[PDB]
């Protein structure tokens, strides 16, 4: 009638009533917690542009991944597993990648990514990226991670707030570039103040399991790690 309007009808595909099922519990369940930082990849994207002379592309998720998996390496206590009461420390890196498609948003996992080299990375998430494609993967390669990782940078939402997947206590939701500036090089020097993209990586964290400190220390290594990849190494 005319108040009310006619609609569409949608029916609710299982694959997505299951998300939306795990999504409300967490939501009923977890306490989320947000964090935000941004860092440096300028001198990290110069480093990209001498990795293309190889004939393996790769991009920056690749070392958002392999610095979460060098931050949770040296930082454990920030990759557990929340089953039921206690926290279940994993000193295994399961990365999950969220790739977004037509079908919706997959998350394939990573097995041991903490082990693996940068090259095969990028060769691991084109591989994840074709299987999540033409929709071979089963289910289990989308399950069982340690933790998530998600760049909507890709495409815009400055800030994002996510929603953590159980059982996971972190996910990880990247930004644009900023021109953030850094100042006058010389301390004495004429050098105009200086606009640099800055990537922004947010924090995604359960209040109950994750230490406000262990996250703080987890983006700030982060940041750190990612001020060089040396570091990362």
Same mark, same amino acid.
């Given at each position: 009638?005319?108040?009310?309007?006619?609609?569409?009808?949608?029916?609710?595909?299982?694959?997505?009533?299951?998300?939306?099922?795990?999504?409300?519990?967490?939501?009923?369940?977890?306490?989320?917690?947000?964090?935000?930082? @941004?860092? @440096?990849?300028? *001198?990290?994207?110069?480093?990209?542009?001498?990795?293309?002379?190889?004939?393996?592309? !790769?991009?920056?998720?690749?070392?958002?991944?392999?610095?979460?998996?060098?931050?949770?390496? +040296?930082?454990?206590?920030?990759?557990?597993?929340?089953?039921?009461?206690?926290?279940?420390?994993?000193? %295994?890196? $399961?990365?999950?990648? *969220?790739?977004?498609? @037509?079908?919706?948003?997959?998350?394939?996992?990573?097995? @041991?990514?903490? *082990?693996?080299?940068?090259?095969?990375?990028?060769?691991? !998430?084109?591989?994840?990226?074709?299987?999540?494609?033409?929709?071979?993967?089963?289910?289990?390669?989308?399950?069982?991670?340690? %933790?998530?990782?998600?760049?909507?940078?890709?495409?815009?939402?400055?800030? %994002?707030?996510?929603?953590?997947?159980?059982?996971?206590?972190?996910?990880?939701?990247?930004?644009? %570039?900023?021109?953030?500036?850094?100042?006058?090089? $010389?301390?004495?020097?004429?050098?105009?103040?200086?606009?640099? +993209?800055?990537?922004?990586?947010?924090?995604?964290? $359960?209040?109950?399991?994750?230490?406000?400190?262990?996250?703080?220390?987890?983006?700030?290594?982060?940041?750190?790690?990612?001020?060089?990849?040396?570091?990362?190494?």
């Amino acid at each position: 009638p005319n108040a009310v309007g006619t609609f569409t009808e949608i029916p609710a595909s299982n694959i997505r009533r299951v998300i939306a099922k795990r999504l409300t519990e967490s939501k009923s369940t977890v306490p989320h917690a947000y964090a935000t930082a @941004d860092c @440096d990849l300028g *001198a990290v994207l110069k480093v990209r542009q001498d990795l293309v002379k190889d004939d393996i592309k !790769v991009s920056v998720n690749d070392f958002i991944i392999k610095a979460a998996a060098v931050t949770l390496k +040296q930082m454990p206590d920030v990759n557990v597993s929340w089953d039921g009461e206690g926290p279940k420390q994993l000193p %295994f890196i $399961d990365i999950s990648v *969220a790739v977004a498609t @037509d079908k919706g948003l997959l998350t394939p996992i990573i097995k @041991d990514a903490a *082990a693996k080299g940068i090259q095969e990375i990028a060769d691991s !998430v084109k591989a994840l990226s074709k299987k999540a494609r033409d929709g071979k993967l089963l289910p289990e390669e989308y399950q069982g991670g340690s %933790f998530s990782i998600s760049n909507l940078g890709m495409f815009g939402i400055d800030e %994002f707030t996510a929603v953590i997947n159980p059982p996971q206590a972190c996910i990880l939701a990247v930004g644009r %570039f900023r021109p953030v500036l850094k100042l006058t090089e $010389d301390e004495e020097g004429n050098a105009k103040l200086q606009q640099r +993209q800055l990537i922004t990586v947010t924090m995604s964290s $359960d209040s109950r399991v994750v230490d406000d400190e262990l996250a703080t220390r987890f983006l700030k290594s982060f940041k750190a790690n990612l001020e060089n990849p040396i570091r990362l190494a």
